Subunit: 464 residues, 4 copies
């Protein structure tokens, strides 16, 4: 059962908007919105969205496997060995948020302070004492971005697994000699760093010059979750405020995806006339170039929605009905919608490019969609006995074993949010920058128009 | 009663090292070490120190007033008007950690997300609605370091007050015309930014070319707290590990200050022979240039301790008894003491340059000394009824009034750690980067050699 | 008669290697090598080449017109108006080396000191007094590379004309309003700068993602000059030294072009067996990335010449027979050929990326190929009476008229080397950085193996 | 006979302003203005000056020796060995414009292309073949400013000699071991680079915090050339245009120096009333911060000429009589004097900071003062037989000997302008960027108000 199976199962349900049903529905962990900082929904005047893995939730593991296959094909096309074609995407290996160390070719799971929680070289998991040879303080400086790449996004899940596949392959292939920082093949030396660069280049190519989008839009039922409650929630948001889209994708792809997301024989509710997806938005902006978008951005352009090309020139006019923007900056949104940052709830899936940056640079309110939570919540509740035992032991060898047993329930790289009793960097960033979070933003449907999301005030140790 | 009065009162007490007395002493809030993250003291192999406001605690408000007077004199010397000489340092106005906005000339108290908690233009406190003209989202981007300067250090306390004095003076002096971003005097325009730059320049000059150090070392009993328990604690640290000094100050000043700090007719305990301050340290390093020290640092030099000058050349030798280093980097300490970062407890007063940077760049364990806590703890316990009422009301106009009444007990700029129920940026940084903290590191004396400092594990909302 | 007609006419001639014929041939201006600094050919141990417009001389105006058409088609494809399709390349307008001012949309011909010699807005040539409104000192700061782009290369000739076409078109099209820095079309504003950026982007796209190379290699007799004396000269160079190729082009294109350049039924001389082009080179390097090549360069790779793809890994081996390199740096050449810079004569057509940079960064000896000189020499000798009259007048209105009459013989933008008696920036750079220069490097064939190219010593005014 | 003796000898002469005497006087090489590019004096509307070594010509070798002594004293004060005190400035060693190579500790004389003409390690002159070990191509990349420092200014003459003294001293002192890149003293290693940095720091300190200015202004007759014709020339310039001062020095020093330069019992001519130096200038600007001055500069300030301090604020007013400016940019001059660049003749001694930068960045006309030419002209004419023989030989061992014999007449580092028949970088920069040049700008006195300075037009080799 993948997290997208859970999402699609809930997506298939019709909305029962009886007040008592909603209040009961939201109490269930899977339909709940979780709260890091208090947020009064009545103060929100604009609801903003990205598209990928928020509105358009790509099905798992089908989409990751497609991106993996095309990335492998691209690497082989540029001269990587044929054996790469025998790889096959394995969703049980990668957890999101791992750090690839380009010096030693390791995938690392770290806490918020750069402490090592898991270390794998290829598919070999390196235990604590053996990591000290390469990591004498069991620690990395995360912000050394020349050395470390943090595989933060759901789009990074295939390349997370591919990196481990490649290290595994070159390590065990007799044509190559394993060295500390790469692989030697006679008069050729491939460092883990140049390997990583090829992989990054190939992933980028697949998404922006290859056939990934084309293969996606030709079989949208295979690749994209569809939920009839999406138009209902957006229509209700538009009754009490403004709704905008700000996506890094271009207009042609956005139009294809959004048209599918709204392709029902009805509008917001069953029995209502169907409405075009654009009608649900007060402002539509593509080619956003987040996170640069939240600083100086790029020049504001207008999409010719007939041809899908940009009109020539910087757009200097006002917000018009039916206009579609390209580029610009977050100030564009604020000026055109007459909003200040704390009036905006921005709903995204990119912990860095959507949530961290809109919070820190603009003071927007933030809703982080975490698709894997749809399944991790089930593992967390089903295996709570493991965690509680671990808590009790905390109050050594038994600790490591329960930690391992708990973690393996999530996959070979453990929970997105912890390893045993130790929280991941990703978990710490969710708590710090996401005001609200959930497996899907659809869970906002089950809360009244002026709900007060509440979180406990924080006290320092000397204040307790 | 200043915080240094509290510190000096505790400093005057002799150490009762009876186990039961210590356990009772540490229970009292004023002699306690507070814990943000668990720390097993038996794992610490090296204890590191800065000097200023950690070993050498400068008396308040005498030292701030001295630095204020010399800074004013420097500004007048370069052509600021004579009326500056009528200013007098007022310790009730500044709270540490305020942000000077060089665009509009305001001192701001903000939370961790850049939200405005207090705004003062000169000595005029600007209420919420009036701040929206300059701060439409009641928000600043803290990391716009061209515009905002965060007055983070105890050395910044005089210039915090001086900035408000200057804005107040120019605003109310008839020779000048107040403008949005500065003051006009006929054909001269002084922006708040250039004013701020002059003040910064003058503070730097006073500390490094003026008479501040000279005036300090000629009356050390007036300006520096002295505690006979300092040699005792350091001697006990040296019994179980290594002890090092890493200060930004130069050797001549360090020697004068440290000699005074150890100038008792005895050594670690009464009745013992006096020992030179250097004998308490396995490694002494001056001109550290933190925070650069925790990255590439500077070249390692050797101090000629006879002349107080640097020997010519990069020092390439080993750790020798009696050698004093200059410059280098944190890797110097680790290599020479054979330590890894998590073996080190570094004790400092600079939330950024000592604690944040040693944690994030090197994974050192951290102890933050917060001198003002020595008094803020008394206000917190004496006025707990105010905070509890505020907590109860949280569960509008009454809220603002109790908030104001609570805050004014700390000074015109409120507590270092909060305004009402809202935590400051400074408080959030203490919690995030200081593993331990206290009004003085001397409180470590009251804990056994292998104490386990404990903090509760953190859980995400969906895990609760 | 284009300069490539002249080159092809000389290329059709067989080589008469009788000593007396050669000495007579080289005396003629069209077959001469011109000398800025003395160079003893016997000291040259390596002869280096780029490919484009040196070995592969593209025919004019056919090649410029092809690149122009494809660039226009690309701009229309991205949304420029259909009227662009009515443009047609006009070789009489552009002279190489003009500066496009992106602020005011002008093409400028300047001297070495940034003084304006010619100014055209579209096809309107702006006389001296009218240029002072935009250029108060009749001067530009050439190195303000954010504002000025110097159209230095033969590849820039189509975009030189296209920029003037576009300014002309938008200026005279009623849908647009002309402004100081661009064109307004209702709520769209296209600055000359963003227009220029589109043009640059389109030129780059045409060369590296469009069909330019494909259209070139499918009709090489139309697009590329072919000379049976090329293998003869290279074979004679290899008898007395080493020969290398260092091109920015990739291997697949280089192989197609070079195979055509050597496709005769004979080798170096008529009657000799044909030899593959690679056999003429001691070292072959593609993807050179000049000018970066002459600093740190890029990592050295090996071309798999069977597949045309790069082998995986950095190449760490020695110079091997038949190996083809990719990337690297100029130090690669020096180390593998055992040469120092002054042992190398590097023959190129890029005044900046080939000649200036190899001279200034490495002290290579330099030979600049200037294809247009093949025709400009004819204009210079045929119209010498105009220049001599101008010289005599110099020793006002008559001066301007003779200047105009002289310049128009070269085209609407005058000689590459001067306007009247004033030398261009390009001329000054040739003299400063090109040790030798000629319309074709083939003119080296007509000089003996150890010729001493001589230039007069320079004296300062006070030394004369 | 130093060049300042020559200057002072001519300075002692009264001005004979009879037209025929002037025309005869200017024909003599020593009173001539030399011309690199034609300049019509009637087009000049503003005459601009720096002060140091233009208006205030410091006497040689007294001033160099003073700066040398104070720099040595500063180095000893910071811990360099006592033997430095036995050094004594020797004007026969340094020639201006040498390059210190901080990697290998050599002084190099180079041509415009970075080719080695002279190489000295300490006082050991390294012959051609031996330089190839460190300089395999007998070539340096001058613009590698991390490695090479070009000792361009007359202020650099003492540190040129001091660098050679230090390398010589450490090389021959038994306490130190000579290494390729520095000196080892047990556990200390001093690289030539850190040595160079100390020297630079000490020179800067001596000029801006030490006693150099103080010692200069207390004995101005010893240290500064004085010429009664200076007020005459400036007064005549003011009759036909505007006159401005733009100096890097501060106002207090400028006032002391300029007051001395004008301290005669008369004004422009004998018998006329004395006038204050300021009255000779339409615009006075100090703290210019050239070369930054010729780009964005610094904010414009006003000097309070009563106190010598800056008024507080940016000066926003107009040009007023008696106002003195500080900072600003070259656009300040142009706007306030209503001038364009080619209307300005700027007279300076800094080949880079005055002449190169005003030419390249602003298109100013330029006059370079070269004080040493006052003597080098005498050597050039007295030893012309040596140069002519060298010219004849050029048309091997005899060549080297005549080259050495010629060069030694100028000093151990040869002529500022050449070594034998090879021109220096400095000579090439004079020709390229100085429109006019002379040993003193006073030679402009001997030319009529609207003289046309003429230089021959330049022709390319193919145009001859």
């Amino acid at each position: 059962t993948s997290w997208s199976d859970r999402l699609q199962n809930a997506a298939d349900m019709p909305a029962n908007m009886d007040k008592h049903a909603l209040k009961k529905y939201r109490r269930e962990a899977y339909h709940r919105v979780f709260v890091n900082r208090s947020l009064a929904m009545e103060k929100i005047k604009c609801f903003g969205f990205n598209m990928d893995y928020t509105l358009a939730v790509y099905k798992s593991p089908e989409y990751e496997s497609l991106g993996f296959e095309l990335t492998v094909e691209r690497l082989v096309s540029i001269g990587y060995p044929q054996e790469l074609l025998s790889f096959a995407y394995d969703s049980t290996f990668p957890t999101r948020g791992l750090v690839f160390d380009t010096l030693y070719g390791n995938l690392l799971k770290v806490d918020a302070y750069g402490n090592l929680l898991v270390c794998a070289h290829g598919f070999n998991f390196i235990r604590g004492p053996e990591t000290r040879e390469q990591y004498p303080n069991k620690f990395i400086q995360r912000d050394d971005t020349e050395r470390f790449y943090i595989l933060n996004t759901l789009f990074n899940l295939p390349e997370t697994y591919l990196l481990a596949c490649l290290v595994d392959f070159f390590t065990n292939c007799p044509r190559y000699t394993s060295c500390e920082t790469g692989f030697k093949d006679g008069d050729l030396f491939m460092s883990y760093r140049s390997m990583f660069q090829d992989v990054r280049d190939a992933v980028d190519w697949v998404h922006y010059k290859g056939s990934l989008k084309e293969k996606t839009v030709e079989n949208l039922e295979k690749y994209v979750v569809k939920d009839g409650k999406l138009p209902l929630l957006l229509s209700r948001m538009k009754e009490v405020g403004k709704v905008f889209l700000a996506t890094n994708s271009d207009y042609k792809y956005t139009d294809k995806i959004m048209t599918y997301l709204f392709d029902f024989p009805h509008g917001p509710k069953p029995g209502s006339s169907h409405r075009p997806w654009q009608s649900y938005f007060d402002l539509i902006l593509v080619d956003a170039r987040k996170p640069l978008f939240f600083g100086e951005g790029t020049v504001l352009r207008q999409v010719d929605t007939k041809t899908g090309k940009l009109k020539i020139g910087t757009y200097t006019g006002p917000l018009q009905h039916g206009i579609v923007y390209s580029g610009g900056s977050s100030d564009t949104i604020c000026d055109l919608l007459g909003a200040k940052g704390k009036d905006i709830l921005y709903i995204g899936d990119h912990i860095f490019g959507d949530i961290l940056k809109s919070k820190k640079r603009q003071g927007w309110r933030t809703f982080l969609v975490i698709p894997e939570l749809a399944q991790e919540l089930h593992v967390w509740t089903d295996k709570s006995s493991l965690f509680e035992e671990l808590q009790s032991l905390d109050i050594q060898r038994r600790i490591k074993k329960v930690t391992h047993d708990m973690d393996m329930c999530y996959g070979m790289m453990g929970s997105l949010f912890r390893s045993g009793s130790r929280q991941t960097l990703f978990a710490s960033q969710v708590m710090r920058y996401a005001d609200l979070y959930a497996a899907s933003f659809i869970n906002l449907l089950y809360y009244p128009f002026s709900y007060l999301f509440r979180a406990a005030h924080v006290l320092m140790p000397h204040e307790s």
